[PDB]
Amino acid sequence: TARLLRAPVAGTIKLGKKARTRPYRTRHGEEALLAEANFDLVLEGKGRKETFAILQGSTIFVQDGDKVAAEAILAEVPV
């Protein structure tokens, strides 16, 4: 019922100014974040900047400034 968003490349996470998040314990008991507004998540790769539309109600598994590897889970987006 939800799509998983993964990092296409290694890079650093920028949540941005429009981002509104807050603590969230997922259905599997993991400590994460809940998007309480629509915002763009940014992944700064070496060769390109990737940007992802995040919907209100999405789970966010990363924090601003995190360094992530390619294929790391970034978010779970309800459909």
Residue numbers in the entry: 352 to 430
What wording appears in the published article?
Second, cyanobacterial RNAP contains by far the largest sequence insertion 3 (SI3) “insertion” in its β′2 subunit (630 residues in Synechocystis sp. PCC 6803; shortened as Syn6803 herein) out of all bacterial RNAPs. The 630 residues are inserted between the two helices of the Trigger Loop (TL), the key mobile element in the catalytic center of RNAP that is essential for the catalysis of phosphodiester-bond formation, NTP discrimination, pausing, and cleavage of backtracked RNA. The largest by far SI3 (~65 kDa) of cyanobacteria stretches across the “body” of RNAP and interacts with the initiation factor σ, thus sealing the main cleft of the enzyme. Notably, the SI3-head module forms a SI3-σ arch that seals the main cleft of RNAP and stabilizes the transcription initiation complex.
The cryo-EM map reveals a strong signal for the Syn6803 RNAP-SI3 domain, but local resolutions of most regions span from 4.5 to 7.0 Å except for the subregions making contacts with the rest of the RNAP holoenzyme. Since the low resolution of the RNAP-SI3 domain does not permit ab initio model building, we determined a 1.6 Å crystal structure of the SI3-tail domain (residues 352 to 433; corresponding to Syn6803 residues 343 to 424) of Synechococcus elongatus PCC 7942 (Syn7942) RNAP that shares 45% protein sequence identity with the SI3-tail domain of Syn6803 RNAP. The SI3-tail is a barrel-sandwich hybrid domain composed entirely of β strands. The “RTRHG” loop (named after the five conserved resides of the loop) protrudes out from the main “body” of the SI3-tail and contacts the stem of the rim helix hairpin. The conserved residues R367, R369, H370, and G371 of the RTRHG loop make an H-bond network with four principal residues (R79, E89, K93, and N96) of the rim helix. The SI3-rim interface is conserved in all aligned cyanobacterial RNAP and chloroplast PEPs in various plants, but it is not conserved in E. coli and other bacterial species, suggesting a lineage-specific interaction. Disruption of this interaction by deletion of the RTHRG loop led to increased ubiquitous pausing during elongation and an inability for RNAP to reach the end of the template.
